[PDB]
Amino acid sequence: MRAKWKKKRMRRLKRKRRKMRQRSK
Amino acid sequence: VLPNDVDLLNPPAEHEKKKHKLKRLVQSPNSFFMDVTTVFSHSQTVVVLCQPTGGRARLIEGCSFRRK
Amino acid sequence: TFKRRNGGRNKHGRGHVKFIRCSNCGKCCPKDKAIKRFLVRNIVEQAAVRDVQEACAFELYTLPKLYLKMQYCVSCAIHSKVVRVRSRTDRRVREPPQ
Amino acid sequence: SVREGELVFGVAHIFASFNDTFIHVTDLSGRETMVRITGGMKVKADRDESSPYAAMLAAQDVSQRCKELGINALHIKLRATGGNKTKTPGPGAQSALRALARSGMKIGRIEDVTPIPTXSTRRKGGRRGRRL
Amino acid sequence: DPYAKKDWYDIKAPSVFEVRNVGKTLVTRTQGTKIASEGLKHRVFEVSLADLQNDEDHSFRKIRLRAEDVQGRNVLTNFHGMDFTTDKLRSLVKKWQSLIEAHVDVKTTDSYTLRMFCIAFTKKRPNQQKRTCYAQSSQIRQIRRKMVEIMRNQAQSCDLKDLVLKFIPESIGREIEKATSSIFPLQNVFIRKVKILKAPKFDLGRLMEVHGDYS
RNA sequence: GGUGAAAUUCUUGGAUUUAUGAAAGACGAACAACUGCGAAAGCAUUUGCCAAGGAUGUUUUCAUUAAUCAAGAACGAAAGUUGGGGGCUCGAAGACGAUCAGAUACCGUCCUAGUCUCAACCAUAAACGAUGCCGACCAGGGAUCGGCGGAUGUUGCUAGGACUCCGCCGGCACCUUAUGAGAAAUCAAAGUUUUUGGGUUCCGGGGGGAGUAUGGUCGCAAGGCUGAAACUUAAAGGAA
Ligand SMILES: [K+]
Ligand SMILES: [K+]
Ligand SMILES: [K+]
Ligand SMILES: [Mg+2]
Ligand SMILES: [Mg+2]
Ligand SMILES: [Mg+2]
Ligand SMILES: [Mg+2]
Ligand SMILES: [Mg+2]
Ligand SMILES: [Mg+2]
Ligand SMILES: [Mg+2]
Ligand SMILES: [Mg+2]
Ligand SMILES: [Mg+2]
Ligand SMILES: [Mg+2]
Ligand SMILES: [Mg+2]
Ligand SMILES: [Mg+2]
Ligand SMILES: [Mg+2]
Ligand SMILES: [Mg+2]
Ligand SMILES: [Mg+2]
Ligand SMILES: [Mg+2]
Ligand SMILES: [Mg+2]
Ligand SMILES: [Zn+2]
């Protein structure tokens, strides 16, 4: 996978964690 | 001239003439004074006998100057 | 592997060069990298000079010329055969051909 | 009110795009249209509206109509699309100009009047250009 | 059918030029609410200076003539600016030399507000060995300053008629080339373009000064 | 009109095309270069004003005041964020027309944010010469940019400018070559290194997991900076 798009995939995955963790705080 | 066809201690007087003033075996200025009341060849001041420039001051055609 | 000493462009002692747009496809390309050709030809093709000269309404008249500066991106210059792939030794020759 | 031998000059505005050809004849002021025939009026397919053959037919109709109005000489003002688009005249410019010369019209002063920006607005297609 | 109701008119050029038979133009015949004279007034005609002057050396210059009045069948025009042909300018702009351009807004003695555009190029010396003849930016500004100064003086004193008489022989171009030679030798010094920004309101008396009785 | 060909789309209520004129906003062609300036990012229409700067010139002055730098600071393309102005062109998203087995694409048509500007943030790029800075030394050659020195006779020119020849200092580079270096490509530095030491900062230690998790910190956000382990694997990789 092109490195730029793998970087994009990880950033999306980090947003969900950032939102899936602040949901319970 | 090749390095081995020249003597560093006794270079020709013409070679040292065209070398940079700071790169000669002994540093020597290219400037000098002259009469007209002495005037510096590279005067930065307006004497109108001499007009300062980026190098030697521009002398006037009228008067005659004698190097000293 | 580094293919060219100039990196494919002509830039020394400056940071940024504004781009131009390829005359063929409109691709953005730095002006120092684009292949530039200045075409000067008669506004009337050689196949029609005789007919136009016979129909001239003036005893004397010089047919004007058509000046066009063409700036190609690399892909269009190669595809249009403006330039060709050269051998490793011939890449260094910068003088224009005959 | 023209005596024999005198030339009555018109101005032929030839717009030779890569999709169509225009042969527009006016007076010296460009404010009175005489005849306006395009390559699209002489063919059936869109792909042939800019062809040299279509431009030849359009020029023959323009020459015949000009003789009816007393116009026997034409100034040529050729142009490409111009602007930020291609500056190269289309494939119908040479055919149109040659056909006019071979129809009794006396060609006057030829000039290129493509609109050239002295800079320009951004060209379409994006910075990567048209990708074929 | 529509062209059967159009009357042809002859275009007349001012007395400054040699040939006055510029050409012919038509317009719909006078009808209620559409006067023929109103349709021809302020019509701009672009004709080569080689036709007005009957000299093929002036083929590179175009003259803008606008119709002022319509006396009978003749359309009386007047100078409305000039410009180079596209081929002329493109032949002068070459690589390995400096291009110098200048513009200036000036008012003649006839209240004509002009905007003259000058152009010049650096010139090589006969014995020059280096391939380029570039001028330093400071030299370019000195040259451009003299272009503006000379253009003001030639137009601020003379009237429009006398000013146009200087454009035909390019007297202004020679004076600029003679004054700037001490800064940098120049070649192809021309008044590239002249615009009319503000013309005085029409006055038939002055129009007929440069036009004869074409009757 | 547009395309490989088309269609969406516009059009006898006058489209496209031609002339004149006005408005708007953007952009600054040609000249324009193996050219210039800037710490880098970057900088290209004229003229004025404001402060700044390199180089050159100097028989001016101070006299080691320097080099490189943890911490800590200034600046930092584009995109993006907040609000105001502006809103031509182009144009993510979106919609449609094609193409196709499918086509959320490439091609075409329309268009939102954006693109421009002001105030305030963000601090990242193949931000590249993929090469940190200061110093010395070590081949040849021509061209070019800035300044200066010398020589010289021409200018539709007002001593000087333009050009010609010799040289000096500084700069962007290029060409030939190895007596050098290197895994080689190649490099006049990437040379003067097992014959190993001029000074100093940053930084790497098989491939992945991973610039991920976690904690801290900065940010309005987007994210930035700092940054693991478990586990997995016998190659991955460079040049030719
Ligand atoms: K190139
Ligand atoms: K900052
Ligand atoms: K040098
Ligand atoms: Mg490769
Ligand atoms: Mg520099
Ligand atoms: Mg860059
Ligand atoms: Mg292709
Ligand atoms: Mg000079
Ligand atoms: Mg420059
Ligand atoms: Mg410009
Ligand atoms: Mg730090
Ligand atoms: Mg920024
Ligand atoms: Mg980084
Ligand atoms: Mg790096
Ligand atoms: Mg550092
Ligand atoms: Mg760096
Ligand atoms: Mg020099
Ligand atoms: Mg080499
Ligand atoms: Mg060591
Ligand atoms: Mg490792
Ligand atoms: Zn292209």
Automatic annotation (TrEMBL), chain A:
One annotated Gene Ontology cellular component of this protein: ribosome
Region feature Disordered, mapped onto this chain: 1-25
GO molecular function annotations of the record: structural constituent of ribosome
Gene Ontology biological-process entries: translation
Source taxon at top rank: Eukaryota
Claim: Ribosomal protein is one of the keywords in the record: yes
Keywords noted in UniProt: Ribonucleoprotein, Ribosomal protein
InterPro entries linked to this entry: Ribosomal_eS32 (IPR007836)
Keyword Ribosomal protein listed: yes
Protein family according to the UniProt entry: Belongs to the eukaryotic ribosomal protein eS32 family.
Binding partners and assembly: Component of the large ribosomal subunit.
Protein name listed in UniProt: 60S ribosomal protein L41
Taxonomy of the source species: Eukaryota, Viridiplantae, Streptophyta, Embryophyta, Tracheophyta
From TrEMBL, chain C:
Keywords for this protein: Metal-binding, Ribonucleoprotein, Ribosomal protein, Zinc
GO biological process: translation
GO MF annotation, one: structural constituent of ribosome
Lineage: superkingdom: Eukaryota
Cellular compartments per GO CC: cytosolic small ribosomal subunit
Coiled coil: none
List of residues binding Zn(2+): C22, C25, C73, C76
UniProt record similarity statement: Belongs to the eukaryotic ribosomal protein eS26 family.
Protein name listed in UniProt: 40S ribosomal protein S26
Gene: LOC101248302
Covered range of the whole protein: 2 to 99 of 127
Automatic annotation (TrEMBL), chain D:
One Pfam family cited in the UniProt record for this chain: Ribosomal_S11
UniProt keyword annotations, A-Z: Ribonucleoprotein, Ribosomal protein
One Gene Ontology CC term in the entry: cytosolic small ribosomal subunit
PROSITE patterns: RIBOSOMAL_S11
Gene Ontology molecular functions: structural constituent of ribosome
Comp. bias intervals (Basic residues): 123-132
Region of interest (Disordered), ranges: 112-132
Family to which this protein belongs: Belongs to the universal ribosomal protein uS11 family.
Record protein name field: Ribosomal protein S14
The organism's taxonomic lineage, starting at the top: Eukaryota, Viridiplantae, Streptophyta, Embryophyta, Tracheophyta
UniProtKB/TrEMBL annotation, chain E:
GO biological process, one term: translation
Subcellular location: Cytoplasm
Subunit field text: Component of the small ribosomal subunit. Mature ribosomes consist of a small (40S) and a large (60S) subunit. The 40S subunit contains about 33 different proteins and 1 molecule of RNA (18S). The 60S subunit contains about 49 different proteins and 3 molecules of RNA (25S, 5.8S and 5S).
Cellular-component GO terms for this entry: cytosol; cytosolic small ribosomal subunit
Key words of the record: Cytoplasm, Ribonucleoprotein, Ribosomal protein
GO MF annotation terms: structural constituent of ribosome
Protein name, per record: Small ribosomal subunit protein eS1
Organism encoding this protein: Solanum lycopersicum (Tomato)
Family, similarity comment: Belongs to the eukaryotic ribosomal protein eS1 family.
